[PDB]
Structure formats: C-alpha cells, structure tokens
Amino acid sequence: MKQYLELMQKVLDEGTQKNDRTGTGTLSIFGHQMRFNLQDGFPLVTTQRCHLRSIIHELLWFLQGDTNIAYLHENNVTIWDEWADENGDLGPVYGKQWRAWPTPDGRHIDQITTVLNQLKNDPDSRRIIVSAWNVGELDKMALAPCHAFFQFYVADGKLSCQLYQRSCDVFLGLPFNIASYALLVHMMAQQCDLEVGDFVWTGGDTHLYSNHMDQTHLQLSREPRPLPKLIIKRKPESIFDYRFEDFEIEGYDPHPGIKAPVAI
Amino acid sequence: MKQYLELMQKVLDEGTQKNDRTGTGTLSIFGHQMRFNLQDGFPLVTTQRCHLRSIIHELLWFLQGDTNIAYLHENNVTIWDEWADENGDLGPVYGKQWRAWPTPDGRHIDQITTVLNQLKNDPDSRRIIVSAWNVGELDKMALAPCHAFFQFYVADGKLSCQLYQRSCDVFLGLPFNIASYALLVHMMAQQCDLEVGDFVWTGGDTHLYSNHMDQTHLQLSREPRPLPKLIIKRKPESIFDYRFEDFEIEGYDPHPGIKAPVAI
Numbered sequence A, B: 001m002k003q004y005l006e007l008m009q010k011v012l013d014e015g016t017q018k019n020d021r022t023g024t025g026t027l028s029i030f031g032h033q034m035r036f037n038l039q040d041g042f043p044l045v046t047t048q049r050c051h052l053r054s055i056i057h058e059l060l061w062f063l064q065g066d067t068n069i070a071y072l073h074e075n076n077v078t079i080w081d082e083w084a085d086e087n088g089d090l091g092p093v094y095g096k097q098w099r100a101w102p103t104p105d106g107r108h109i110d111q112i113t114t115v116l117n118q119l120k121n122d123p124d125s126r127r128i129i130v131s132a133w134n135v136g137e138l139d140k141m142a143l144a145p146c147h148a149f150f151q152f153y154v155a156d157g158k159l160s161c162q163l164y165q166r167s168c169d170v171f172l173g174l175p176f177n178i179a180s181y182a183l184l185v186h187m188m189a190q191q192c193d194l195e196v197g198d199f200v201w202t203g204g205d206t207h208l209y210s211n212h213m214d215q216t217h218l219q220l221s222r223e224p225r226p227l228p229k230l231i232i233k234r235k236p237e238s239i240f241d242y243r244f245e246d247f248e249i250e251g252y253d254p255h256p257g258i259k260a261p262v263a264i
C-alpha cells in the first residue's frame, strides 16, 4: 500500500545493520507510525498476494483463547508449525492472554470481554486496552508477542485502534498483522454498532531480513492497486461466534505473490 | 519545544470534543509520534517553567519500587497527594511493576535489572521491554498507568527508547513525562557505557482539557528557547544509587510558568 512501500523503502535507506537472534542479520530502524483510514478500504496489500484464509483463522483462533495448533491444522493453516512442540502447544501466547490473563490471586481476566463492555458502556474511556505482554509468563511462551499491545478509541461513533508491535518483520509479518487487526476492528465495530475509524500501527524494532533483499526490491518496483472491501455476511450473537464463511473480500486484484524463506 | 508546540497546535486543529472520566471534557486526537535526538539537548520545555526537583525525585522513587508518598513528602514533592489514601499508599503502581512484577507462581520479576542485563549482554535483542500494564492488578491501582509501556534499542553505540503513553494530558503531564524518560535514558546509557540516542514518544488518547485552552494559547504564542544541558556529576555503582545532587541542568532559561487546574 503506499504507506507500506514507503516504510519498506525507509528501512533500506535508513536501516542500520544489525545481528539478530536467528543469526541471519537484518536492516532495521527503531520507531515508526502509520495510519490507515478504514473507510477508504481494507488494508490488504496488493503488491503481493496474501492468503486471507490464514489471517482469518488465526484471529478466530486467538479469540477462542486457544494455544494449540490442532485447530489451525483442521483448517490447513501451518503458520505456527515451527514453534509448536510435539503436542502442538505454544504456551500461554496471544489467545491465552487475551481471553484469560492469569492473576496472582488465582483468578483469570477476559480482556476481550471487558473491552466489549467498555466500548458499550464507557466508550470515552482512555483505558480500553488489551495486552499480550504478560511479564510473568514470557518464559513459558514459545515466542514473545510481536504484536503485544493495543488500544481502542471512540470518537464521533467511529472505532479506532492503535497497535504497538515491538518487533516487526516488514516483508513477511507486517502485511499479515495489519490485515489481522483491521479485521478485528471491523468485528468489534459491528458488535458495538459503531462505524470503523482509523487503524494506527506503531512499531518498535522494524526490520528487513538480509535474505529478503531481492524480494523487497522486486515488490518495491510494483504499482499498488486500489484497496479491496470487507463484507460481513451476518451479525453473530457475540464476537466469539464468527466463522470463516462470514467474511467476504471484494475488489482484491493483487500482483502475483513473492516466495521468501522464513527466519525461525 | 518545537515538537511539543506543534503537537499542541495539532490537538487544537484536529482534536474532537470528548467527554472524559472527570467530566471536565477534552479535545483529543488518537495516535501520534514524535522523536527527540537527545544529542541536541535535554528535552525540557522552555515555553513554560518546569520544576526539575519533582521530575527527578519521582523517577528515583519509581526506581526504588516505592508506591507510598512518604518519600516524596520528605523531599517536598506533592504531585501524588490527590490519589494517595490515608496511609499515603497508591497501590501497585509504576515503581512496583517496574521492580517487582508479581507472577502467578509466587515469583517476582525485576524488569529494570533484566533490562540492564539485556543491554550489557544482548543489546541486539528486540525484547528489551518494561511494562507497567499489569492487567491483573489494575484494579488495585489508584490510577491506571498513563506511561504504560517502553522499549529500548541499541544501534551504533547509542541507546534509544520508545514510550507508549495510552493517555496524555498535553498541557500538564506531557512535558513532565518527556523529561522523566529522557533522564532515565541518560542514567541507563551511563551505566551501560553507551551514548544517548533518540527518545521516541508515542501516544494513545492525546488530549487537552477544556479548562486549559486559554493557558494553551498563551504558551503557544511563545518562542521556544535553546534546549538546556544535562550534566551527571558522578557514576554510581548501580542505577539504583543515584541521588538528586548527581544531576545538574545548565543553560535553562525558560519563559515564566503558567498556572492551570489539575483534573482529578
């Protein structure tokens, strides 16, 4: 998208050479923000073809509070295969913290539910937050949350959301994350009878892996196409009752996809 | 400061009228980011006189893991009086989460120390994070963290930091928060033998209280002055051994202060 490609170009021009956890090496910048008015269309890249099936199921997976890949397998999504153990468990990652943040006094807090309640009863609240960064359980996670913290905001009947992503693989992960949260905002907005507002993306360590250079330059030479449209065929009783069939994307005509190795 | 004043003006131009928790009413925007190259000087507002004594003592207080105002009273700082109970307790706020985030299995994590360890042994890590947003204890806090999440970054021997502030009182709180974190970066950098890099500030609900409008336009009509300089007179054994006396600010010639009512 225009914002996406400019960020990608920015990492190449200003990025600094860093040695990472994987030993692959990256080019990175620290601190960046981009806004997406969801009224203009669904922020799904067009300079690269994205598998919408994987994005929708992972989000529905998160909302269930599931941390076992069994569910993703039944739907043919193998994006979390590398980090899962023999049983398909990942530890108390994303979903677990969203749906059941464990407190020291034995209780469990459902952040998504409180957020829905805040949106409906106290939309002006400045504390409408969901955090996946549970310091007490990071050690038990197969991987620390990349998209770790997000906040909702309501103004003029429009629902906005800002995401703080501490670590970001610009080529492989970013376009997946943007679509994922944009989708959530739509689901939230529908359940709370609000209009969609802006999706603000804020990143920490924003990088481009050294073995993605060629693919990046390839994508950078492509002209972005008009943004698609997200259609939701029905309104479920709750935000936990959505299904894959409920979502329809229209006007999505992307350039052919680009293959690239994943850094584990 | 140029960045500060432009932000202020932006809230006036693009802000939307919102009703808040205090019933005061605010003008607010959602999502904003500004950078401060700490090499250019210490980011302490000049178009308004700021009380450096309060900023430093609160920070030292945070670093001790203290949540009782007794310490602040002993040094004549009354910035937290309105929220403290009869005993001067505020609940597990900032300092408690920083020095002793309680895990569900009876342990306690010192986030400041682990960060120091990461900067010395693994500066290229993308998980150098401190979070005050402990979902499980928000209900026990006198007030939910405004400056809730921050991340460090190292590149070219320079230490940078990005802060995510979910709620921001632009007139009363922002200049205080900028100076506080900028001071932390210098302390961190000095302990780890690194140079100071950038301080990136990112905000969620960034606002201006309706009863702060006149004061705002008054300040906005002022010409910012050259940034002051921070001088640290010594290098303590640990980041927990600093004292008010170790800090010296030079070349600070601000405009006269502007009084304004605090929204509780």
Ligand SMILES: *[C@H]1[C@@H]([N+](=O)[O-])C(=O)NC(=O)N1[C@H]1C[C@H](O)[C@@H](COP(=O)(O)O)O1
Binding pocket: A126, A127, B021, B143, B144, B145, B146, B147, B167, B168, B169, B170, B172, B173, B174, B177
């Ligand atoms: C809160 C604050 N704090 O110490 O508590 C700080 O450091 N900076 C702020 O600007 N800040 C403000 C934001 C908001 O106007 C209120 C807190 O209220 P809620 O956002 O309603 O929780 O204080």
Ligand SMILES: O=c1[nH]c(=O)n([C@H]2C[C@H](O)[C@@H](COP(=O)(O)O)O2)cc1[N+](=O)[O-]
Binding pocket: A021, A143, A144, A146, A147, A167, A168, A169, A170, A172, A173, A174, A177, B126, B127
């Ligand atoms: O959704 C995501 N977004 C994303 O870009 N990341 C990337 C960032 C980075 O390249 C890597 C995780 O590594 P580290 O930052 O070393 O923990 O994976 C990883 C996730 N993720 O695992 O869910």
